[PDB]
Amino acid sequence: QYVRIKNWGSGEILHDTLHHKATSDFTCKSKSCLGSIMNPKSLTRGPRDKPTPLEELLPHAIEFINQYYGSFKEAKIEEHLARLEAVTKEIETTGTYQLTLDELIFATKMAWRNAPRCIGRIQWSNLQVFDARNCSTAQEMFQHICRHILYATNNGNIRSAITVFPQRSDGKHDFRLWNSQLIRYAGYQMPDGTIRGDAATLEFTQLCIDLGWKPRYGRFDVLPLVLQADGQDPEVFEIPPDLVLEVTMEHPKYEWFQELGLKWYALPAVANMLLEVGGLEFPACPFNGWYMGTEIGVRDFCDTQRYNILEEVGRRMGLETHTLASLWKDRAVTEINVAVLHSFQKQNVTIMDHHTASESFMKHMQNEYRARGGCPADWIWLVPPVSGSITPVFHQEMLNYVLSPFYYYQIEPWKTHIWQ
């Protein structure tokens, strides 16, 4: 009937009726393009109540095993046949099947390598894999999670890593991290109508209160890990301050910039995505890279829906703040980016300027089309929030499609959960 459209700024909504009068055919769909949609169902993989039908779990299983053994130079044919063999057996013996650690490792880099929205895929090979497939309880998740955070933070010399938890069996014994990301600040909707901390989190920050968390009502409070294991209920876990490393924001000129008091954690880790490989699916598997300047400087510090600091950084800059055409916004935002850039470098925290990141992507793309002729790429995501055209990737045409293995999104845990 109609498509819903969200404006993540005003968070307003709209119902598109008009698109029905869509003439004939478009560039990919029968007249209609939803590439501008944030979370399309096409990239999600939701809940379940029963296991995974053998007539599928098996075809996909075989496919992966081929991709796998058909990888390393000089194939181990007997093993390729051998595995396929044991695989089938195991499948037709318990329904699902288990992966060999070398497979997981393969799966994860491939999946990562297949993330159309990632721009640092040139590193797809150097990835740490933590096998937690035999985890049992919430307390054990929380333990591996700490292990992870500690490993990737490496005191500023960030390291990409992923810690794979228990795969999905039937669908009622899922392991899920309820948070959006490993480390993330909390946002309270304080009295005076204002909002402190991270306007983004708001909702989640509440659930943490409802599940019993102590809101230290501040501007940079690292939210608690809300872990649910085996399909049980989520148990709240606060993170060891000692583990969350942060950079303090200071400009290389304007000395009044530290007066703003801003800071930000140095570890970007996606917590709620889902890995799909060989017709198997792990609903819990956090992975992390490292920041790219403008993420913090332009998205987190300068968004109507986040910390929102653009104007004030301008006022303390002179700029005719009340006259759009003056380009004060353009000037301000740029210095803020020098700040975040300056700061991490000073305090020694692996970070990357958007200009060198784009160049690095292009390289990777080359090797990737040369390597396997193709490279999934969502333009809307790979081009920086600022200075787009001044970058290589902006002028680069690209095709976006889901392959496999692959990393998917998934319905918010609290929405679909049996609170026994």
Added chain:
Amino acid sequence: QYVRIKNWGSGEILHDTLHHKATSDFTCKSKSCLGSIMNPKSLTRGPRDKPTPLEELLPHAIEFINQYYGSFKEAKIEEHLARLEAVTKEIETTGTYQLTLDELIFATKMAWRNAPRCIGRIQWSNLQVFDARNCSTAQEMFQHICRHILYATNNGNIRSAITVFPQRSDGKHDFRLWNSQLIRYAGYQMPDGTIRGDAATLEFTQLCIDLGWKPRYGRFDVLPLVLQADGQDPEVFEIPPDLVLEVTMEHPKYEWFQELGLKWYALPAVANMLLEVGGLEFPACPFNGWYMGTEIGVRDFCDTQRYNILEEVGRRMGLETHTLASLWKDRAVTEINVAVLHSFQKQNVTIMDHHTASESFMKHMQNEYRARGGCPADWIWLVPPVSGSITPVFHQEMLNYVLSPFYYYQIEPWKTHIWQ
């Protein structure tokens, strides 16, 4: 088999094979998105050899007439029936049919209003329409074209206008403007391996030489109008210097900025697009708006494939030009934008800063979803080449689809032309 991908920067090409292993379904197409493609066939409308099949030319004809009469408050029912009547008759009397001037006027604003890539659609109502449907020869095109340029330039107070030429009959009597745009500089691939003027034009600039134009080998030479009428051959016409208004580039601080000697015409007019309305199609119909700062400042002055001036504007700024991470590119580009902005304002030439343009679009979108529930919008095009996230439209989800009436692209004239 495979899809071609172009990188409009290096102009390099690639063949995407991989997309075939596309899992299942995507956000719009059966796993595959080409929204990042510049000129997809979906938005083009090409050549013909025979008239337009009555079983179509008629259904579409009726559809438009309904949209039309179903527009103005308090319908002229008898006329709505009356027209539909005369329309049918005329159609079943000569094949195609003619539009009433009020229809063209309607058609054009609707078409414009339906341009998913236009960001100034909030002006869709104030548009000047010039009826040239009875033009006959090249010399007559060249005349209306001058008329047009003169009208829209209005000595700096730019005015949106469109001059509709002879519709399409069979397909061998097409009227086409061969240039990409009314006013555009020429690019010569000079001796020393360098390139002067506009690297973009290059190819076309040659054809103008081959059709007998005198290359004044400079940095800002307005190309000649290459007009072909009735399906004949293109005749070259130089433009009256007196008509092409230009702004001289000068910074409000760095006084050495005029030393660069840069300038740019104040009239943006698309020349080669095709209007489709009521199953009719006019292959020649130039329309114009007015510039939006960053078009000149970021796309034309700062592109590996255009004038390319970013570095030098930085060197004369101090900036550590050889260290990407220094953000000199970000700083430089911004001042250049102050320049182009400063300059037009000074010299009194209707221009618009990208920040107020986005705000203005959002408004329009609101009225548009409220008006007819929907608004075709190509995100990739509506979000500025710089300071994207600092704008409203970046966070706005949107649907892109072709409606009608509508403005289409079309195969380069010289590619498909009988040179008798």
